Ligand binder design. Sequence first.
Ligand SMILES: NC(=O)c1ccc[n+]([C@@H]2O[C@H](COP(=O)(O)O)[C@@H](O)[C@H]2O)c1
Ligand SMILES: [Cl-]
Length: 188
Amino acid sequence: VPRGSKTFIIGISGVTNSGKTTLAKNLQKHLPNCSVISQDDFFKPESEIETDKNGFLQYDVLEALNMEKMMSAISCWMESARHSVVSTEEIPILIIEGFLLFNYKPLDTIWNRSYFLTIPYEECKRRRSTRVYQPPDSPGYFDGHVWPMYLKYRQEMQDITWEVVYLDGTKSEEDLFLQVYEDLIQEL
Ligand SMILES: NC(=O)c1ccc[n+]([C@@H]2O[C@H](COP(=O)(O)O)[C@@H](O)[C@H]2O)c1
Ligand SMILES: [Cl-]
């Protein structure tokens, strides 16, 4: 059986501002031959984003994202992964991280492991206000768009077809890194 075509793909989703991107990065520096793709790199330009009845920019839905572009990026990684180990098993690793991964049906069978970072409403709001997006959050954007769209995502995930490990995002960076690392090494 020829080597080189196997991969191990990890999804890290979760609410906005829950430490997803930092978790991906901490895992990557402790894992061999590991890449990270970030869903936020595939948002459409603000000019292509729709606006709802109350004037809120619609960013927190899959329509805001070029998911075909993101698939193409995943495909590029897979082709590179095939040549990452010289012939003479060492299985290349991809971490895909973003707030809206587990409702996207074309990727439903891609995940070898799945983690979902959670933080409650008040702490999520507080964290979100310390961060600057481009475009910036409008007044009342968290309540008017971000949180309702998050709750919509969680209901969409009620009929998911694979196991998800839910994580407490109020834990420290190191705590979260160790928990996931401890689980991950057993799956690899
Ligand atoms: N990256 C962008 O171009 C952009 C623009 C406006 C809002 N956002 C926000 O990014 C959030 C998702 O990213 P995080 O999970 O890193 O918070 C969404 O909740 C969305 O409101 C991103
Ligand atoms: Cl798309």
